[PDB]
Amino acid sequence: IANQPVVIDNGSGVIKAGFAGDQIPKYCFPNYVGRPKHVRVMAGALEGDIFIGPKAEEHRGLLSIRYPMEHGIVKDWNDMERIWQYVYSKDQLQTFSEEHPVLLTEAPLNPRKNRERAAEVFFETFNVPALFISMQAVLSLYATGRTTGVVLDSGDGVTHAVPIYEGFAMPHSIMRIDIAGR
Amino acid sequence: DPKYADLPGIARNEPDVYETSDLPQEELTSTSVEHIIVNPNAAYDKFKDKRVGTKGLDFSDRIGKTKRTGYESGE
Ligand SMILES: Nc1ncnc2c1ncn2[C@@H]1O[C@H](COP(=O)(O)OP(=O)(O)O)[C@@H](O)[C@H]1O
Numbered sequence: 001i002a003n004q005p006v007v008i009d010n011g012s013g014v015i016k017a018g019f020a021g022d023q024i025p026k027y028c029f030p031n032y033v034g035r036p037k038h039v040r041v042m043a044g045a046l047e048g049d050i051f052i053g054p055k056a057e058e059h060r061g062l063l064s065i066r067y068p069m070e071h072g073i074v075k076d077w078n079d080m081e082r083i084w085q086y087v088y089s090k091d092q093l094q095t096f097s098e099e100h101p102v103l104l105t106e107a108p109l110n111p112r113k114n115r116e117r118a119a120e121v122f123f124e125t126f127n128v129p130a131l132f133i134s135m136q137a138v139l140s141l142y143a144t145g146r147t148t149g150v151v152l153d154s155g156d157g158v159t160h161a162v163p164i165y166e167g168f169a170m171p172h173s174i175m176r177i178d179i180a181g182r
Numbered sequence: 183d184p185k186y187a188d189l190p191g192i193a194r195n196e197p198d199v200y201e202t203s204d205l206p207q208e209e210l211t212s213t214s215v216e217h218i219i220v221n222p223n224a225a226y227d228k229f230k231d232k233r234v235g236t237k238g239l240d241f242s243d244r245i246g247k248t249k250r251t252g253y254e255s256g257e
Contacts, residue, residue, distance in 0.1 A: 039241070039252045043232045047256045064249075 002129060005101035006093065011136070012072040012107070013156025013182060017087055020103070027092040029053055031156075033066035033079045050079070052086045071157045071178035072107045077117055081125060097126035104133040107158060108176045137162040157182030233257035 009016035009025055016025035035050045036059070046055065051063055068076035087093050093100075102122065106115070115133065122128040137151035141164065151162040160176035186192050210217050235255035244250070 036251065037249070039239075039250065041252050043229045043234050045234075045253070047235065049251075 003100045005103050005130075007103045008087075008105070009136070009139070010105045011155050012069055012158040012180070015083075017092060019100070027087060029056075031067070031069055031083075032056065033068060033076055033083070034059075034063035035066070037062055037064045050082055052083065053091070067182075069157070071182075072155060073110060073114060073178075077121060080118075081121055084126065097122070098129055100129075102128045102131040104131060105136045105139070106133040107155065108135060108137075108160060108162065108174060109171065135162070137164060138167070154180045156180055 005020045007018050007020055007022065007025065011031060014028065014030045017027040018025040029052065032052070033050075034052060034056045040047075051059060056063060056065070066076065066079070068074045068079065074080055088095070088097070104118075118133075122131060137153055137160070140151060140153065141147065141149055147166040149164050151164055153160060153162065157180050158176065158178045159180045162175070163170060163173045186194065209215060234253050235257035236253040237255035239252035239254055241250055241252070
């Protein structure tokens with residue numbers, strides 16, 4: 001039988017995460033792949049060789065940050081796993097891949113191969129019971145409650161004019177320009 | 183003394199060893215120093231249990247894979 005899903009709001013630049021029914025994504029931090037830049041010497045010098053969050057802010061110019069999300073389109077799938085592991089950790093999820101259903105966000109018309117790659121992760125390495133990944137604009141429409149709506153929204157290195165109306169799939173009218181604030 | 187007795191020219195009443203009667207930090211006290219002991223055994227036992235892994239921490243004019251880091255392995 002299923003469990004409580006986890007509302008994980010990703011994005012080209014910032015990831016948001018909380019469980020189902022919550023009002024606040026309890027685990028928010030941007031989308032980044034950090035790992036050290038120096039020669040570790042003394043004892044107590046934090047191992048893991050990949051650090052996120054307080055360690056990231058704590059070691060800003062000490063950790064080489066990476067952004068494989070080429071306008072959201074990521075390439076360090078292994079590091080994506082580890083990002084989720086950071087979430088999976090006692091820090092954010094404190095659970096397993098099977099202990100909870102997953103919810104995830106998807107930008108429009110991305111290469112399907114990426115999605116499938118993530119599915120390989122989510123159901124082979126990670127073992128998601130049930131999930132679904134789709135348009136963030138749709139979720140924003142749920143928040144507004146509107147059904148008829150041209151959603152203008154931009155990620156961090158992605159811009160996307162999304163003319164929607166009552167869930168009607170209008171990909172010809174719907175656009176996206178993968179360039180933004182990044 | 184017996185030599186003094188047997189030698190005629192040797193006079194006496196001589197205080198032989200004639201002598202002269204001779205008669206007999208702040209840096210820590212500054213407005214800003216805090217000289218503190220680390221409590222060697224306390225801090226030692228603290229960091230002692232903190233294992234350190236290493237795996238060929240090699241650096242001297244070694245070319246290949248530009249970035250390097252000491253104490254490579256984990257423990
Ligand atoms: N006040 C702000 N001004 C400009 N840019 C911001 C601000 N707050 C967040 N951002 C950037 O804009 C992006 C937010 O748009 P969103 O669609 O959430 O992006 P993403 O899809 O990249 O998470 C964030 O990734 C962040 O880098």
